[PDB]
RNA sequence: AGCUGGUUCCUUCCGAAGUUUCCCUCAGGAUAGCUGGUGCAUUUUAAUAAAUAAUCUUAUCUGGUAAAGCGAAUGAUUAGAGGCCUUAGGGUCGAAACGAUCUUAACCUAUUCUCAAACUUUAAAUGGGUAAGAACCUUAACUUUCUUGAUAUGAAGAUCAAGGUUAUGAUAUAAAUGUCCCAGUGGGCCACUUUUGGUAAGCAGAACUGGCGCUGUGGGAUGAACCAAACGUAAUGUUACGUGCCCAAAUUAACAACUCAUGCAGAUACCAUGAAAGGCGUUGGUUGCUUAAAACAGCAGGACGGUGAUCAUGGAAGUCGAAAUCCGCUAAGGAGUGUGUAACAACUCACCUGCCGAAGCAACUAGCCCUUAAAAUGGAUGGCGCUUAAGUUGUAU
RNA sequence: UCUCUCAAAUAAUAACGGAGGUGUCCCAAGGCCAGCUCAGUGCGGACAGAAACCACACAUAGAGCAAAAGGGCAAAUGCUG
RNA sequence: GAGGUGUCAGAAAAGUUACCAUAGGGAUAACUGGCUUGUGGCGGCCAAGCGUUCAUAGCGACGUCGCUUUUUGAUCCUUCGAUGUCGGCUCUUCCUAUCAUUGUGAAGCAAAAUUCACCAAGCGUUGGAUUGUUCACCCAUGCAAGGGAACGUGAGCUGGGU
RNA sequence: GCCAACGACCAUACCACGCUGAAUACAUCGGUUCUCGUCCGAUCACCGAAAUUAAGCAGCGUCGCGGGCGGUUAGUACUUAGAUGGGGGACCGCUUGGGAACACCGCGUGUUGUUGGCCU
């Protein structure tokens, strides 16, 4: 009957992968973590204090507490069955800022530029992101010679 | 003596190595994977002819023995022992397990019914893939048919359709039948033991000096 | 192995400050039992250099050599500067300046083993009972600091590096020692 | 040994290969309380180099460590100490140099004037009541040797007396009688003013005068004998307070060649042709041989 | 009489029926595990703020008379 | 009495679960999940969005499976080749040699063979988190008996001002929320896919998902579950599965092959079985041959001599077997493919010829059929019957 | 109750599935700091041989950290004060 | 805070019932049938060898593919508000993988004789000693005393074993 | 460029074998009163006088050893999704999406933050 402890299956979760071996280098702390910023939790198993319990590895939350040597990140974790909210106190040695958020911020500044540029052009804005549409009337010039070549196959050979 | 091989013909299970966890595995019945004039320079026997499996099945060590024995006997008897390199490119490092039905003396009490049915290790099997080479056999160009006939008779000892392909490759060396002539009729290949050493360029000047001098001398 | 090397037109390339000083001569008396015999063994080192010998505990229970772990099997003293030179020369005579070409290590260091320590000074004093000596002389290059040091630890040399040949040459020079092949 | 070993060798960071930094001491020294968010912590870093005493205030950032003040003992001939820039004395002066230069650019001159009479007494600089609290600086020795009587700590005493709040127990300053503790305060002063350097002069000036001819020359050549050393170091302390010289460079600047000097990296066209020419020469040698 | 231990069969059907249901981006901000102190002077912050157009204007008038703070950011 | 049996009218609407946990619990409860009912608050998700919920996409994280690897750590392993080194243990030439030369071993090197669920650097797919804006961003400044700093900064609360288009895509059957602590359930069963134990099972047990449970109808002849499809009551129209007839429907007003079956020829997924291995049956393929100086089948005709050359002698001149194996004469004939006298010998085939003077021969591939393929009340493509099919493959109405 | 695997690369995940362990052990094998460099190998050193102590070079964790196993670690989390 | 219930979310607990009783259970054994077929039985494929010679007349290693379901396990679907154990007596019909008989092909079958294989179950396959016994083991005859399926067959017997 | 100190990322920085390193300098490298630490002033503590860029360190070279990245390998492997597709099964074609790895090949062999100095 079952699995259950805490460290179940974490041979490769807490594995430092080849040539990244040792003492967690200082840049990790140098990043200032501020309440409301989106953070990704990545289990570093060499920093054994403030360990993010195995379900929380690559489950990403927003910061609602900063404490003297822990960052309290609210990960919303799918239960059987009512999404309860968990404040997990985990260290910065395991906590890395999500640049999922920066994409949003880059957009505000870009949208404001496009808005201004368009307004000074008079018309028109259309700053909302449209995914890759079936494109265009494509002219291929030979140049550099007509095509043609067909293909295949003699693919025997065991 | 060990059931019969239908039960283990198919690759059903997560492959069991001869491991520090399996300890107790009976010795592989296959000892010698290379019988021949193995000591012959690659230039002497320019043919390779293969038996290649066209099926995802497992060939037993028991089957492998029999096929080797067939190949040796036909080549040695008709065409003299030292004219061939027989390499069996299939080693049996997967362990067959049998849960014997231990009730002894119709006496039961604790038996073991299906409970716990843990297989003990009885046997060794090679796991074989479509276009995996079973046999590779080296010969001189006048001994083509004799190689092929030896291979034909080895097929039957093994479960599930195998076919003979005559490789355009010079022996056990990778080089297609043009390519080792391009290299050995220049200065570029020098002899290793059933193989050839490179033709390098890597590396670099110091190594190149010597190689060029050795062929020329 | 493959260089645009040259040996550029600088002028001669001698051998300046890096010349060959002696790191330590460490003497050991190895006695298979502790108690009184070990203490008596200590007397022999202690008087010779004047410097008090330190003891090191048995790593393990070998038992075939009838030793148990942390028995305090044997005593040794390391000697550096002035007293190192005098004691080395004294034991050299006892050994005969005829060593062997092996006695020599690739880190250019050399050893003797001698019986009768009484040959180099030390009165017979019959309560102490005659002890053989192990000589290991580590030769270094003056300013060996680099590969020893706690902060700014660097790995020695091209040239520097003491070899068997370098150490045998130094031996041949001063002391006029015969390298003597068995 | 072996192609094979080199592959799996996960060889130490970078400064562990240079043996300068163990990284373990570095973790503890830098690692801020996270609930002190963007605050630059303040490390005093002392390295003893065998003719510089270099004391720098540094902080960590994600791009690299940022140094706010740097003092070299090669700054001390301005303040009149031409000689013994390896000294205990020169350490106390270099520590005062950093401390004061830190207080000069960062406007804390009038408050926190640090132990002005320098009586070597065991004082960490007390926070001035109803004033914002003075620079808390932390000792990075790194791998520097945690040794009683070190110039590492002679610099720290001088930095404290320069006004900085450096938490330290008194043990690692020079002259502390181990059995018992028992802080000898006279001895503490003597190291500052180079009296010990001067004692080295005085005793052997009668006896073994080989050592003058060698060691502690320049003191002959500038007429600064033994008793005069005490005054130069006391008046270097006054001169450092007075002036922060800051140091400016007007140079411009050649990255390229001058003269030899970086041997312009042998183009792929050059390498290949040379390699062919070797194979060409080897064929030529064998033709001569035949 | 071997029953069956553990099927997660139909659990995921069950969940989507009446939704597993994400809560809220609370503009009215929840607390717990804030190191007691912030909370104490957060309480004081709210209180001391009493309201406010004159309060900001009087302290702006202080900052122009004082000017103030070249020292703080560099230390 | 937690057990078994039974429980008394109807219609309408919605509609389960055999799972979680704990329990002398495991034939049962409680509990959570699923279920209904009762409603409530607001609908730019509301009555004449710049607020979301949750699915794609996008952007931003995670992972050690599949695969790959072993000349990458760990764990297994095969083959030669080349070698230092006295590390050699034997020998030969040596009294002996750290002498020359073989021989064989530990290591060492570059290759090479083969593998892992309890190995993995590497490393997918499919998965799982967070974001895609007025609950946003940016400018400016207030409290701080704190945390905190030589900062009444930062960190929050937060006041004030700036902003073209609200800043992926479909949608919302309106959604969220509360009460009942509600029943019913706590015995599951089956299939695709993935899998563990087991030879296996209509077997025991997971992962994901759908059914069945609670589901007929049409279809699979039949059938709880497979297919198609979810059913108010009817007309008319059209589909899935089929179309000789049974049985609604072209023995097609189309078409090209394949197959002829003496004892389950064959006849629609699941599926009610069929192989390993064979076939100069038949059918289409692939490759290599002999050859106009007449070939290939098939007759005619030589098949010897140097020389019982010779070793096995038990007997072998060619031939129970073999080291071997070349000349000569030549058109060509193996010191020999067999038949066998115990031998000699007589026969044979290669080799070359007379005729044949232009076709054919060998080794492979795989369809149907046949062999393999035998079992028991009489018997089953579901039936009749079907052979240029009503079979089998493909194709068109 | 716990590790590794099963477990199908988030997490969850069962069988009388596989390989195993837990009821204790410890004032350090806790806590902290300083110094050190181990597994293993090469080479020297009477007594010393393959292994004793002494000495140097190399060496990504191959050791050691009570114990099961798997993670982690090299001026340490190990070892020694 | 400690002392503890290891059935470890926490009863305080020994046997036996073939003298038994009840409430139930095909959620569950024994037993018929069904799946399976390792194990059993029967039949092949390849062929190293046996066999004077000559691999296959008759045989056949090491291997390997099946079929049968009549061995025995594995299972528990159905049956426990009852499906009448085993044998022997009696009586049935079929099946072959044919021992005999018919007609035949093989043979290292000369004759005699037997062995192998085929179409074939139309027709035989028995009388006893002992065992409860199928099975087994023996005796005797006849050219020959083949093997299986409906766990056949207890309102048919017997009740001998169980 | 170089050098220092302090560092980030973390082998393009390692390894191996040579060559070279001017100047402010690290280093090489010396002395042992004192403090202090060591069996030993090797380290460590101190004094900084005489030498030297050989080494560390740095750079430069190397068809090296290793390490990075891209292609190549390979749309293969593998796999999601589908069929009243095939095959006796084992499994396998097709069809809609996604997509490796070893290897081989090419090209690089530390870059850069702060702060001070030196500049060939």
**Which of D98, D232, D123 is closest to D188 using CA atoms?**
D123
Q: Which residues in chain E are contacts of D107 at CB distance < 8 A?
A: 70-71, 74-75
Both tokens of B122, joined, read 């009885």
Q: Give the pairing of strands D43-49 and D138-140.
A: parallel
Give the rounded distance of the alpha carbon of A50 from its chain centre: 22
- State the helix-helix crossing angle for D88-105 and D152-160, rounded to 10 degrees: 40
Q: Which residues in chain E are contacts of D108 at CB distance < 8 A?
A: 71, 75
**Which of D234, D115, D120 is closest to D185 using CA atoms?**
D120
| Chain C interface mutation, best of D19, D45, D274, highest count of C Cβ atoms under 10 Å | D19
Name which of D35, D106, D135 is nearest E35 (Cβ-Cβ): D35
Are C84 and C24 spatial neighbours (Cβ–Cβ below 8 Å)?
yes
Element (H, E) at D275: helix D268-289
Checking each nucleotide's C1' against the CA of C8, the nearest proves to be: I19
Q: Is A71 helix (H, G, I), strand (E, B) or coil?
A: strand
CB contact under 8 A, E32 and A81: no
Checking each nucleotide's C1' against the CA of B9, the nearest proves to be: I90
CB contact under 8 A, A81 and E5: no
Element (H, E) at D282: helix D268-289
Q: Give the pairing of strands B162-167 and D52-59.
A: unpaired
Are D57 and D97 spatial neighbours (Cβ–Cβ below 8 Å)?
no
**Which of A27, A86, A79, A93 is closest to A60 using CA atoms?**
A86
CA–CA dist C174, C161 (Å, integer): 20
Are D127 and D165 spatial neighbours (Cβ–Cβ below 8 Å)?
yes
B203 contacts chain D (CB < 8 A): no
CA–CA dist C134, C112 (Å, integer): 6
Residue C62's contacts (CB-CB under 8 Å, 6 or more residues apart) are: none
Q: Give the pairing of strands D43-49 and C74-79.
A: unpaired
Integer CA distances (angstroms), A83 to B38, E14, E21, E30, in order: 69, 14, 6, 17
B touches A (3+ CB pairs < 8 Å)? Answer: yes
On strand H, nucleotides with any atom < 7 Å from a protein CB are 27-28, 38-39, 45-48, 61-66, 73-76
Least Cα separation, residue A122 to chain D (angstroms)? 42
Q: Which residues in chain D are contacts of B204 at CB distance < 8 A?
A: 275
Name which of B204, B208, B216 is nearest D286 (Cβ-Cβ): B216
C154 contacts chain D (CB < 8 A): yes
Are C31 and C38 spatial neighbours (Cβ–Cβ below 8 Å)?
yes
Least Cα separation, residue A94 to chain D (angstroms)? 14
Residue D257's contacts (CB-CB under 8 Å, 6 or more residues apart) are: D264
CB contact under 8 A, D105 and E70: no
D266 contacts chain B (CB < 8 A): no
A touches C (3+ CB pairs < 8 Å)? Answer: no
Question: Given strand C133-140, what is the order of strands in its sheet?
Answer: C54-56, C74-79, C21-30, C133-140, C110-114
Distance C109 CA to G14 C1' (A): 67
**CB-strand contact B99/H, under 7 Å:** no
Q: Which residues in chain B are contacts of D283 at CB distance < 8 A?
A: 212, 216
- Provide the residue count of chain A: 158
Residues 101-140 of C with CB under 7 A from strand G: 102-107, 109-115, 131-136, 138
D3 contacts chain B (CB < 8 A): no
Q: Is C95 helix (H, G, I), strand (E, B) or coil?
A: helix
For A141, other C-beta atoms within 10 Å of its C-beta total 5
Distance A6 CA to F13 C1' (A): 49
Are B105 and B154 spatial neighbours (Cβ–Cβ below 8 Å)?
no
Place of tokens 């293909």: A151
If you measure CA to CA, which chain E residue comes closest to A35?
E34
Residue numbers after which chain D is interrupted (C to N above 2.5 A) read none
> Which residues, in sequence order, are bridge partners of residue D44?
D57, D139
E touches C (3+ CB pairs < 8 Å)? Answer: no
CA–CA dist B15, B11 (Å, integer): 8
**CB-strand contact B60/H, under 7 Å:** yes
- The runs of H, that is alpha helices, within chain A are 27-30, 100-120
A68 contacts chain E (CB < 8 A): yes
| Chain E interface mutation, best of A65, A67, A71, highest count of E Cβ atoms under 10 Å | A65
Checking each nucleotide's C1' against the CA of C115, the nearest proves to be: G46
CA–CA dist D163, A91 (Å, integer): 35
Which D residues 183-242 touch C at CB under 8 Å?
none
* Alpha-carbon dihedral sign for residues D265, D269, D272, D277: negative
Checking each nucleotide's C1' against the CA of C13, the nearest proves to be: I54
Are C84 and C27 spatial neighbours (Cβ–Cβ below 8 Å)?
no
If you measure CA to CA, which chain C residue comes closest to B204?
C2
DSSP assignment of B159-176, as one string? SS-EEEEEESB-TTSSSB
Q: Give the number of C-alpha atoms closer than 13 A to the C-alpha of residue D108, restricted to the C-beta side.
A: 25
Both tokens of C94, joined, read 């006892």
E22 contacts chain A (CB < 8 A): yes
Name the burial class of residue E4, with classes exposed (0-12), middle (13-18) and buried (19+) by CB atoms within 10 angstroms of its CB: exposed
DSSP assignment of chain B, as one string? ----TTTTSS--S----S-TTT------S---SEEE-TTS-GGG--EEEEEEE-S--EEEHHHHHHHHHHHHHHHHHHH-TTS-EEEE-----EEEEE-----TTTT-SS--SSTT--PEEEEEEEE--TTEEEEEEEE-GGGHHHHHHHHHHHHTTSSS-EEEEEESB-TTSSSBTTHHHHHHTTT-EEE-SSSEEE---SS-HHHHHHHHHHHH-
- Chains with 3 or more CB pairs closer than 8 angstroms to E? A, D
Tell me, what DSSP letter sits at residue C159?
A: S
Count interface pairs B-D at CB distance under 8 A: 18
For D237, other C-beta atoms within 10 Å of its C-beta total 21
Residue D48's contacts (CB-CB under 8 Å, 6 or more residues apart) are: D91, D144, D150, D151, D152
Checking each nucleotide's C1' against the CA of B113, the nearest proves to be: H74
Name the burial class of residue B120, with classes exposed (0-12), middle (13-18) and buried (19+) by CB atoms within 10 angstroms of its CB: exposed
Residue C93's contacts (CB-CB under 8 Å, 6 or more residues apart) are: C119, C120
Q: Is D43 helix (H, G, I), strand (E, B) or coil?
A: strand
B206 contacts chain C (CB < 8 A): yes
Checking each nucleotide's C1' against the CA of D71, the nearest proves to be: I116
Element (H, E) at D49: strand D43-49
Structure's resolution in angstroms: 6.0
Integer CA distances (angstroms), D133 to C25, D95, D104, in order: 57, 20, 16
């Amino acid at each position: 009957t079952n699995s259950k402890g805490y460290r179940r299956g974490t041979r490769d979760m807490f594995s430092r992968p080849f040539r990244k071996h040792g003492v967690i280098p200082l840049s990790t702390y140098m990043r200032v973590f501020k309440i409301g910023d989106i953070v990704d939790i990545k289990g570093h198993g060499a920093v054994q204090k403030g360990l993010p319990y195995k379900a929380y590895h690559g489950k990403t939350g927003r910061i609602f507490n900063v404490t003297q040597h822990a960052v309290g990140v609210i990960v919303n974790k799918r239960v059987r069955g009512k999404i309860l909210a968990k404040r997990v106190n985990v260290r910065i040695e395991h906590i890395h800022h999500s640049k999922c958020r920066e994409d949003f911020l880059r957009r505000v500044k870009e949208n404001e530029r496009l808005l201004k540029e368009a307004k000074e052009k008079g018309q028109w804005v259309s700053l909302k992101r449209q995914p890759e549409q079936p494109k265009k009337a494509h002219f291929v010039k030979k140049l550099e010679e007509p095509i043609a070549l067909a293909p295949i196959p003699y693919e025997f050979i065991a | 003596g060990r059931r019969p091989a239908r039960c283990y013909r198919y690759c059903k299970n997560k492959p069991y190595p001869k491991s520090r966890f399996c300890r107790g595995v009976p010795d592989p019945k296959i000892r010698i994977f290379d019988l021949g004039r193995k000591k012959a320079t690659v230039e002497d026997f320019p043919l390779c002819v293969h038996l290649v499996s066209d099926e995802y099945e497992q060939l037993s060590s028991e089957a492998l023995e029999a096929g080797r024995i067939c190949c040796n006997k036909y080549l040695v008897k008709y065409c003299g022992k030292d004219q061939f390199h027989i390499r069996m490119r299939l080693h049996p490092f997967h362990v067959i397990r049998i849960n014997k039905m231990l009730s002894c003396a119709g006496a039961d009490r604790l038996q073991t019914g299906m409970r716990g049915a843990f297989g003990k290790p009885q046997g060794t099997v090679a796991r074989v893939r479509i276009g995996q080479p079973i046999m590779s056999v080296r010969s001189s160009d006048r001994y083509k048919a004799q190689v092929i006939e030896a291979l034909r008779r080895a097929k039957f000892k093994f479960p599930g359709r195998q076919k003979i392909y005559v490789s355009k490759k010079w022996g056990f060396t990778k080089y297609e039948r043009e390519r080792y002539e391009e290299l050995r009729d220049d200065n570029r290949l020098e002899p290793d033991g059933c193989n050839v050493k490179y033709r390098p360029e890597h590396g670099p000047i110091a190594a190149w000096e010597k190689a060029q001098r050795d062929v020329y001398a | 192995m493959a260089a645009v090397t040259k040996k550029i037109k600088r002028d001669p390339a001698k051998n300046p400050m890096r010349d060959l000083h002696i790191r330590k001569l460490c003497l050991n008396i190895c006695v298979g039992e502790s108690g009184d015999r070990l203490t008596r063994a200590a007397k022999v080192l202690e008087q010779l250099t004047g410097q008090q010998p330190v003891f090191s505990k048995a790593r393990y229970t070998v038992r075939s050599f009838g030793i148990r772990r942390n028995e305090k099997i044997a005593v040794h003293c390391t000697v550096r500067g002035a007293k190192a030179e005098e004691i080395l020369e004294r034991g050299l005579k006892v050994r005969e300046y005829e060593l062997r070409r092996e006695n020599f290590s690739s880190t250019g260091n050399f050893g003797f083993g001698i019986q009768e320590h009484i040959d180099l000074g030390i009165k017979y004093d019959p309560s102490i009972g005659i002890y053989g000596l192990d000589f290991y002389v580590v030769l270094g290059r003056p300013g060996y600091n680099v590969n020893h040091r706690k902060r700014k630890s660097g790995t020695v040399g091209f040239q520097h590096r003491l070899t068997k040949e370098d150490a045998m040459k130094w031996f041949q020079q001063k002391y006029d020692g015969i390298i003597l092949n068995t | 040994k072996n192609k094979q070993y080199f592959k799996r060798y996960q060889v130490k960071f970078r400064r562990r290969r240079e043996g300068k930094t163990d990284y373990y001491a570095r973790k503890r020294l830098t690692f801020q309380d996270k609930n002190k968010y963007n605050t630059p912590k303040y490390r005093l870093i002392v390295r003893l180099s065998n003719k510089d005493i270099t004391v720098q205030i540094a902080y960590a950032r994600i791009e690299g460590d940022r140094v706010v003040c740097a003092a070299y003992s090669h700054e001390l001939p301005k303040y009149g100490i031409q000689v013994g820039l390896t000294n205990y004395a020169a350490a106390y002066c270099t520590g005062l140099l950093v401390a004061r230069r830190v207080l000069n650019k960062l406007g804390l001159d009038s408050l926190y004037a640090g132990c002005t009479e320098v009586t070597g007494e065991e004082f960490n600089v007390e926070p001035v009541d109803d004033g914002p609290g003075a620079f808390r600086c932390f000792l990075d020795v790194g791998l520097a040797r945690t040794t009683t009587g070190a110039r590492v700590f002679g610099a720290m005493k001088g930095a404290v007396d320069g006004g900085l709040n450096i938490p330290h127990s008194v043990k690692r300053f020079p002259g502390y009688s181990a059995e018992t503790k028992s802080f000898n305060a006279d001895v503490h002063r003597a190291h500052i003013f180079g009296q010990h350097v001067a004692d080295y002069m005085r005793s052997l000036e009668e006896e073994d005068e080989e050592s003058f001819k060698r060691q502690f020359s320049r003191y002959i050549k500038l007429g600064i004998r033994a008793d005069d050393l005490e005054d130069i170091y006391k008046k270097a302390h006054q001169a450092i307070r007075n002036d922060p010289t800051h140091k400016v460079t007007a140079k411009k600047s050649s990255a390229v060649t001058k003269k030899r000097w970086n041997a312009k990296k042998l183009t792929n066209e050059q390498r290949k042709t040379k390699i062919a020419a070797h194979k060409a020469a080897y064929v030529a040698k064998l033709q001569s041989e035949t | 009489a071997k029953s069956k231990n553990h099927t997660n069969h139909n659990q995921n059907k069950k969940a989507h029926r009446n939704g597993i249901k994400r809560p809220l981006r609370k503009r009215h901000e929840s607390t717990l595990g804030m190191d007691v102190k912030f909370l104490i002077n957060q309480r004081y912050a709210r209180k001391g703020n009493l309201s406010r157009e004159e309060s900001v204007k009087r302290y702006n008038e202080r900052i122009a008379s004082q000017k103030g703070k070249p020292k703080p950011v560099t230390l």
